[PDB]
Design a protein around this ligand. Structure first.
Ligand code: 8KM
Ligand code: 8KM
Lengths: 173, 173
């Protein structure tokens, strides 16, 4: 990630090896993106961990539904309807990992009308502290089958930026 | 300013001595405030130098008028009308200093219905760079005659925060 400082890259080497390295299946495409956020990591995590409410920190979502008496645990699902004018209409997604202690979460696409077969994403949230400053870096990686990388990278980048905007609005003193 | 890092305070010592130190007139009150802004200093300066448009980076302004064929130069004035519900109704203000090369500007209150007699403010905009990061610190100080300090400090703080929000919105990639 070309936005991270040398110190940020050094402190994140472990997390990248631990959560963002893939054994690529035949015929795939993977990328890692980073976003610096000037807000406390506990706040950033409280936003991005809400699997049932991706529209609150992502673009392009017309609506997101979950079942009645929804319980956020691995295996739960969400039904996303995409706004018009994109190369996707609907997506059914499954929560793959939720680690509140380590601030790791991830999901997989398991259905829908779109072109991102076998898409799987992992997001991690990281605390930085130096002198009297506390800030966050979010890392998000994906793998997907098979322009494709350009579209998926740009969406992931824009969504990380929305997450940053939301968290920074909430963190204002 | 308790928000600045030790490194920021060290690099700003010169500017504080140069632009933000006062020979206090009899019966006064002065304070210095700082705001970190995650945007380029040239962008921050382009916003805050607009003496004719304080409502675009400050709170509490119902309207701000300037004369026809306004020219922004030292001695020009602006007529501010404050929103209702505050200890001030109107303010006439004069541009005291405009230094585009050094990024220093300042103004004085010269009339109006309010309780801030002989209010004078100076704002400076500062570039910071470290590794691949570029950011801004804004310093704003005032002096005013004679609760008063609490009200004026809180307004200056909130306005610096609005400036930060505007600049950071404009700087999004
Ligand atoms: C690249 C990518 C895939 C999935 C998601 C989560 S989501 O925005 O809730 N759902 C979703 C699923 C598939 C696609 C496609 N193509 C999209 C497109 C970004 C509209 C969103 C976000 C970003
Ligand atoms: C403390 C202070 C004084 C002046 C300004 C510039 S302004 O907001 O355009 N005008 C102004 C003048 C006097 C007062 C008072 N009291 C105020 C109050 C903040 C509403 C604004 C901003 C902040």
């Amino acid at each position: 990630p070309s936005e991270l400082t040398p110190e940020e890259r050094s402190e994140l080497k472990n997390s990248i090896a631990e959560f963002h390295t893939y054994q690529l299946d035949p015929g795939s495409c993977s990328s890692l993106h980073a976003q610096r956020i000037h807000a406390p990591p506990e706040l950033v995590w409280s936003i991005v961990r809400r699997f049932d409410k991706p529209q609150t920190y992502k673009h392009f979502i017309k609506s997101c539904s979950v079942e009645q008496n929804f319980e956020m645990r691995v295996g739960c699902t969400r039904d996303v309807i995409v706004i018009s004018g994109l190369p996707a209409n609907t997506s059914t997604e499954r929560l793959d990992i939720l680690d509140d202690e380590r601030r790791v979460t991830g999901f997989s696409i398991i259905g829908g009308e779109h072109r991102l077969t076998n898409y799987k994403s992992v997001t991690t949230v990281h605390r930085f502290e130096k002198e009297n400053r506390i800030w966050t870096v979010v890392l998000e990686s994906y793998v997907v089958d098979m322009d494709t990388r350009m579209f998926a990278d740009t969406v992931v980048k824009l969504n990380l930026q929305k997450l940053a905007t939301v968290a920074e609005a909430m963190a204002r003193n």
